[PDB]
């Protein structure tokens, strides 16, 4: 059951209430239906204002690569500062989106787990998709393409401090 | 669940802005909703553009043909936007946007290959319908379309632009 | 995921414009809903045309015939519109639209082939033959020979055969 | 996905016109709904006719008899209407409409054949259907009984000659 | 879909003090029927309540919970059997206010009973004998002997047996 | 199944003219029992055959197939009820050669019986005739008794004429 | 399946005594086994009779016709025996036994009613059944078709009066 | 199932007059056990028969079929509880020849027992009477004990009269 | 379950090969293994192919077809019950004058409901094989395969699908 | 059910006695295990006598197909490969891996080299080994193998012969 709250100018489900404050949730696996809901919200928040930051809450184990790339491209497309926030975990495509927040604006809570490994179409197309991920990670972490490729080979998570050192995020905060 | 904004679930909100979502697998039920919104949009104004957002793996040929024919029937300019992917019938609808208003975001993947109860001769008839639709809109010859469509591969947005599937690969407003 | 406009669900909105949707397989509950809408529309105006959008692979025969009979029963002209496909009972309903008001989009596919005891099945099948014969103006023997071939017709061939009157591209 | 019309869902709209739908199989939950509608409609006027649309392959016999008894109980004239088909208990409810107010559209199929209890209880129910059919068709028990053995359908005209319906309406 | 009249139809019948027991009895049904009974009693402790029963029976303890609520409320309760009232359903029918227990003409009535120990099964069965004996005024030997026989009673037989008071055709 | 000296133990019992009827009776049980009975008769149309019955009943026509085979062969057939013989199981038990129908002390026997209606009743009437014949009781008494959903103890089954002997030890 | 001595399974043992069991629903693999046995039994002797035990609710029509055609084909007289029931295709095989050698036990039930192909093909199959039933029962095609419309069974004795079988056998 | 050198191990135990009643009792188990009991009597009506019981119980009428068969054959029957004898399993254990009813030291024994009402009661009273006969407890005590959802140790069962010896070593 | 005399191996010892039921890869490799063993026993005496099949996998069928062509033995085909789709191709594929049907069988050359082009390539293989063995034209074969209908054995004889209606 | 024959022998075991190895289904670890065991066994019986390998397969697990391939290359015997019905994906690799001049197809077979829980990198590695294996045995260049394997299509037996997948197409 989604709780209902009231705003002062009607009842909103709590999620719609958070979208009213420019929070966009990316919890759970990323698939085509999640991507279209997230894209619709991002486009709608840009239209409400192309200056005001947008907050993206990420607690995701990854999901469909093309669905995550649609979200990422839409993030790059809008003009707004996008603050990304990792709670719980940001694994595979979820960490790509985390790393894709605006520079200086990528955050994790203290106990989150970050993974850029992609846990286990034609062979040549899987490798093309994978190289697309290498290029995106290189761009946003500032790591080498050869560092990104080697790191992604490793089946392991990063602490928030390591992800900060790696260049996936900027701040690990505890309180406001 | 679907958030509500300003009144409106957010998909209906984008519909009020002349955006029509073609996400996921195309089947008959997707076709009748798209056709429904396309026709309703043409009745709000036959001059204003309509935006078709496409992130689709393909689906039922006849359902896709039905959205195609509706796109060709309405007079409105139709801007097609490829986000994520447009494969099989998805890319036919992308290619079927108004000349010069067919776009892709930079990381999308576009496939014109068709990944593998009617008779053999009717499966061919449908296929030839697609060949001819692709040639009409990509301005490529049938020789190239039939040859290209045999290959189980994706195009990048720039190869797709060069082929005639779309006109613009854009990054920012 | 059915959107809202102005505040109707798009389908109700189309019904307000006198469009009745027959997409998908035809079963008893489709027929009930289609019949409900036709009667309601006739009650709104018995002369204003009614638009019937058909994109159907067919379905239950007696449910098809219930729709067919309700079409012949109401007074309104009915414009039938094939998008995608009209196969089996789908093409029977398309053929049954008011004469000269039967349409197809350019890329639709039309099939009159059909993909209780024996006697009763033949009985239904002959009911079909006769309805087709009436609406296409083809001889029973032609209809019967045509329905044995497992093939679709192009819209222009369907026009030729007498299933529809116009194959249009634009308004 | 039930259309709204103006505000009402279309079945409620029709119920407001004193139409009651009996489409699909008959079971206890269908009989409950049908009975509640007949009873409410009588409450609104015990004189205004009630239209029962029937497109049913039959169903539970005791659920059918519950509807039957409610029909016979309310004072309103009840016009029955066979669209598509009325088989087993469907045809019993059809025949049960007010004399002279039982109709069929031209292409419907009517069947009185019936395609957890003891053998004597099954016969005792069967015999109630003989009596009910004999009453409403004016045929003798031996004829009813002899016909109900035949796994076959009746055309609207045969059904009318038999006493099941009164009128075969084209439009 | 349940039709609307500002009211779904069942709620409409509840406003007229009708309570439907129209399927298998379980805890969920019992909870709903009890809630409706208590509510109707709070609207008026003198106005009759109508209990509609078309049920094959169900969970004994759940049937007994409804029974106890019928006895607890002061209101007259008219019980009406349509279709059937078997096992616990015929217990509730027999538990209507004396003189106010009805059946439509073609219903059938069964007092036969088509994890807990043997002794407990038997205690519940004896509770059923006692309750039937009270409301039918038959002896415990007669109740028990009758419930062994797997058979249905006609409305008339059920009247002679003390299960109901009136078998009626029309109002 | 164990091997004994080499045979599986049921085949070993088959060589001693023992045929087992354990479990529900269906057509494959019937074909297997019939095959064994016919084979045993061919080994000797005089030596007794022992039929061990522990069964809740089963398909009526399959049960009648065993019955007819039993009546067909010339051998004396000793029937032995261990555990239970219910419905068709107790028919076969009763159809043993007169003087040679047996039960163990704690078995339970039931003659109650837990296609179109006329056909279910034709089968039931056939069961009535067979039970009267082999219990040597009037058909009126069988028919009344079979309505009662209950078991008999071996002594009661003996008094009723279903069997001849209740044995504890080899007497 | 129990084993019997002079040592194998009871059903094969019956086969050696020229009995062929049609004891369940008829489908293609049952038709295949039956035909195999029939053709085998003719090889062992083309004159000795063959016993076909039928207890069957029917089954696939073309599978039943395969068995029928094999019965008319082989030279041996074929004695059909109904135990339990013979409905739809089961009764057609019953009635197709050699004239004077079609039996039932007393309490059998016999039914000729028939409780992805086009309508036309289903009718053609139905007419084939009429022709075969008319043949072996000596009844008129008009009467056979009237009979098959009725959802009912016949006692062994009325199946005899009808022409489906020749003897209602109590004991030997 | 391993073959030894009567070659599969279960059949080999049958040659030494052992009958296995392991697992739930249903009609098919009853039929096999009865067949072996009858077969063993035919080999000899004097040589003891050993019945190994490790059962949670099962279908009551199937259990009474085995019980009647044990009471029918003339052999001494030694019953042996390993693991557990619950519900019908403990009836069979208690039905061994007086003096020859055994348990292993860690077995658990339950006489509790985890159609129309009257018929269910009838079956229960048959159980009461069988237990009273072989345990020599009163029907009063038996019926009370069968209400309690509990197991007994082998010694408690011996003192109850369900068995005669709690065996440790041969 | 299968009687012992098993009844299938027995019929194999007399050069009968059963193609009853749907044709898939497993059926194909059994039939082929039996055709090759049968030819190996003698490349001269005939082989009987018993056929009651609704069809099956086209490449499984063609594998059987190609092995029938390959072996030198004559092949009597017999249709009991039905030979539809691939089944009727194997029927027509027996030695000319050695193709039979029993009187009530049903025969169907219609194919009741990989890339589109590969579907059509297979379909044209069938047109050609049918044209060969029936001595009909590719045009009539194609118009015939379009109709969803069965042929009586007598029609299948007229058509060239078989020779003798025993 | 697998016919038996006297030479006793289920008909597959009979074929194996004549040095025929069947590979006539989807290829997986279990099939590969059987095929390798038979190949090794046939070699032990005679490391000169040719071995016949029948192929009617839609492909299967790559690593299982490569295990069969490596075994073919390891045994010294000549390996005649025969394609009936179809050899697709890994099946066509084994077909092309028979001894030069001893790769055959029946006239109506269909041949496909197209490939209808591991990382992107490892899938590329496997596809590379298939390019190399196909290049070696067809004699085509790596470029030609790669672009031909991208096309979702079947070759006829003559196309496959001229492509270098097989040596002979024969009717009888
Ligand atoms: C969206 C919206 C919602 C409520 C009110 C106003 C608006 C403003 N509109 C109207 C139309 N439109 C708007 N904004 C937008 O960004 C876009 C459109 C149309 C197309 N397009 C391309 C695109 C870019 C990236 C992902 C996918 C598609 C972006
Ligand atoms: C649809 C609508 C919705 C809200 C308000 C006004 C309207 C205007 N109407 C009314 C009727 N009608 C309208 N427009 C349309 O385009 C069409 C119709 C009717 C029929 N027809 C054929 C067609 C064409 C292509 C795809 C399938 C069918 C198109
Ligand atoms: C339907 C309606 C809905 C909203 C407002 C007014 C109305 C007008 N009414 C009221 C009752 N009635 C109306 N029209 C109609 O055509 C019909 C009826 C009743 C019966 N009947 C027979 C029939 C014909 C063919 C298919 C099945 C049944 C047609
Ligand atoms: C029903 C209704 C609904 C909205 C407004 C007013 C009313 C009028 N009331 C009130 C109570 N009552 C009414 N009518 C009726 O026919 C009946 C009742 C009560 C009982 N009873 C017996 C019965 C007959 C046949 C089937 C089952 C039960 C019929
Ligand atoms: C229930 C109600 C509903 C709407 C408005 C007013 C009321 C009046 N109240 C309030 C509390 N209460 C009422 N009536 C009642 O009969 C009862 C109660 C409370 C408890 N109790 C015992 C009981 C008896 C038998 C079945 C189960 C429980 C009966
Ligand atoms: C059966 C058998 C088995 C092993 C050795 C010899 C035999 C002897 N045969 C051979 C054929 N036959 C024999 N006995 C028999 O009783 C019967 C037959 C044939 C037919 N028939 C009618 C029948 C009666 C009742 C149930 C069903 C059918 C009885
Ligand atoms: C069958 C058999 C088994 C073991 C030993 C010898 C034999 C005798 N053979 C050998 C081959 N053959 C024999 N008999 C036969 O009737 C037939 C054949 C071959 C073909 N054919 C046509 C046919 C007719 C109707 C249904 C299907 C097929 C009948
Ligand atoms: C069983 C056997 C096996 C191999 C060799 C010889 C024998 C001896 N026979 C032959 C037949 N028969 C034998 N013994 C027996 O105790 C019994 C029989 C027959 C019947 N009957 C009644 C019974 C008792 C209790 C449970 C169920 C049935 C006991
Ligand atoms: C088969 C057999 C079985 C038992 C004993 C001896 C033999 C004779 N051999 C030995 C090997 N071999 C034999 N015959 C044959 O026809 C064939 C072979 C080997 C290969 N080959 C090609 C082929 C043809 C068509 C379908 C598929 C493959 C035919
Ligand atoms: C196999 C066999 C079977 C029956 C009789 C004699 C033999 C001969 N042996 C005995 C052991 N051995 C034999 N042959 C062989 O080729 C091989 C071995 C052992 C190991 N090895 C490596 C290998 C090669 C390729 C695939 C996997 C493993 C090959």
From Swiss-Prot, chain C:
GO cellular component: endopeptidase Clp complex; mitochondrial matrix; mitochondrion
Subunit structure: Fourteen CLPP subunits assemble into 2 heptameric rings which stack back to back to give a disk-like structure with a central cavity. Component of the ClpXP complex formed by the assembly of two CLPP heptameric rings with two CLPX hexameric rings, giving rise to a symmetrical structure with two central CLPP rings flanked by a CLPX ring at either end of the complex.
Top-level enzyme category: hydrolase
Catalytic activity: Hydrolysis of proteins to small peptides in the presence of ATP and magnesium. alpha-casein is the usual test substrate. In the absence of ATP, only oligopeptides shorter than five residues are hydrolyzed (such as succinyl-Leu-Tyr-|-NHMec, and Leu-Tyr-Leu-|-Tyr-Trp, in which cleavage of the -Tyr-|-Leu- and -Tyr-|-Trp bonds also occurs)
Protein origin, superkingdom: Eukaryota
Protein name: ATP-dependent Clp protease proteolytic subunit, mitochondrial
Subcellular location: Mitochondrion matrix
Functional note: Protease component of the ClpXP complex that cleaves peptides and various proteins in an ATP-dependent process. Has low peptidase activity in the absence of CLPX. The ClpXP complex can degrade CSN1S1, CSN2 and CSN3, as well as synthetic peptides (in vitro) and may be responsible for a fairly general and central housekeeping function rather than for the degradation of specific substrates. Cleaves PINK1 in the mitochondrion.
One GO term (biological process): membrane protein proteolysis
Main localization category: mitochondrion
Disulfide bonding pattern of the chain: none
Location of this fragment in the whole protein: 58 to 248 of 277
Gene: CLPP
Keywords: Acetylation, Deafness, Disease variant, Hydrolase, Mitochondrion, Protease, Serine protease, Transit peptide
Keyword ATP-binding: no
Molecular function GO labels: ATP-dependent peptidase activity; ATPase binding; endopeptidase activity; identical protein binding; peptidase activity; serine-type endopeptidase activity
UniProt similarity note: Belongs to the peptidase S14 family.
EC number: 3.4.21.92
From Swiss-Prot, chain D:
Broad class of the protein's primary localization: mitochondrion
UniProt GO BP: membrane protein proteolysis; mitochondrial protein catabolic process; protein quality control for misfolded or incompletely synthesized proteins; proteolysis; proteolysis involved in protein catabolic process
Protein's UniProt keywords contain Transmembrane: no
Coiled-coil stretches: none
Tissue expression profile of the protein: Detected in liver (at protein level). Predominantly expressed in skeletal muscle. Intermediate levels in heart, liver and pancreas. Low in brain, placenta, lung and kidney.
Recorded GO MF terms: ATP-dependent peptidase activity; ATPase binding; endopeptidase activity; identical protein binding; peptidase activity; serine-type endopeptidase activity
Subcellular localization(s) per the UniProt record: Mitochondrion matrix
E.C. numbers: 3.4.21.92
Catalytic residues in the record: 88 (nucleophile), 113
Keywords assigned: Acetylation, Deafness, Disease variant, Hydrolase, Mitochondrion, Protease, Serine protease, Transit peptide
Catalytic reaction annotation: Hydrolysis of proteins to small peptides in the presence of ATP and magnesium. alpha-casein is the usual test substrate. In the absence of ATP, only oligopeptides shorter than five residues are hydrolyzed (such as succinyl-Leu-Tyr-|-NHMec, and Leu-Tyr-Leu-|-Tyr-Trp, in which cleavage of the -Tyr-|-Leu- and -Tyr-|-Trp bonds also occurs)
Modified positions (N6-succinyllysine) in chain numbering: 124
Chain positions found as N6-acetyllysine: 135
Enzyme class: hydrolase
Effect on the protein of changing residue 88 to A/C: Abolishes protease activity
GO cellular component: endopeptidase Clp complex; mitochondrial matrix; mitochondrion
Its job: Protease component of the ClpXP complex that cleaves peptides and various proteins in an ATP-dependent process. Has low peptidase activity in the absence of CLPX. The ClpXP complex can degrade CSN1S1, CSN2 and CSN3, as well as synthetic peptides (in vitro) and may be responsible for a fairly general and central housekeeping function rather than for the degradation of specific substrates. Cleaves PINK1 in the mitochondrion.
Family: Belongs to the peptidase S14 family.
Residues of the full protein shown: 58 to 247 of 277
Curated annotation (Swiss-Prot), chain G:
Active site: 88 (nucleophile), 113
Modified residues (N6-acetyllysine): 135
GO biological process: membrane protein proteolysis; mitochondrial protein catabolic process; protein quality control for misfolded or incompletely synthesized proteins; proteolysis; proteolysis involved in protein catabolic process
Entry's localization field: Mitochondrion matrix
Broad enzyme group: hydrolase
Tissue note: Detected in liver (at protein level). Predominantly expressed in skeletal muscle. Intermediate levels in heart, liver and pancreas. Low in brain, placenta, lung and kidney.
Major localization class: mitochondrion
Catalysed conversion reaction: Hydrolysis of proteins to small peptides in the presence of ATP and magnesium. alpha-casein is the usual test substrate. In the absence of ATP, only oligopeptides shorter than five residues are hydrolyzed (such as succinyl-Leu-Tyr-|-NHMec, and Leu-Tyr-Leu-|-Tyr-Trp, in which cleavage of the -Tyr-|-Leu- and -Tyr-|-Trp bonds also occurs)
EC code(s) of this entry: 3.4.21.92
Result of altering residue 88 to A/C: Abolishes protease activity
Positions carrying N6-succinyllysine: 124
Gene Ontology CC terms: endopeptidase Clp complex; mitochondrial matrix; mitochondrion
Molecular-function GO terms, alphabetical: ATP-dependent peptidase activity; ATPase binding; endopeptidase activity; identical protein binding; peptidase activity; serine-type endopeptidase activity
Keyword line: Acetylation, Deafness, Disease variant, Hydrolase, Mitochondrion, Protease, Serine protease, Transit peptide
Subunit structure: Fourteen CLPP subunits assemble into 2 heptameric rings which stack back to back to give a disk-like structure with a central cavity. Component of the ClpXP complex formed by the assembly of two CLPP heptameric rings with two CLPX hexameric rings, giving rise to a symmetrical structure with two central CLPP rings flanked by a CLPX ring at either end of the complex.
Family: Belongs to the peptidase S14 family.
Name of the featured protein: ATP-dependent Clp protease proteolytic subunit, mitochondrial
Organism: Homo sapiens
Gene assigned in the entry: CLPP
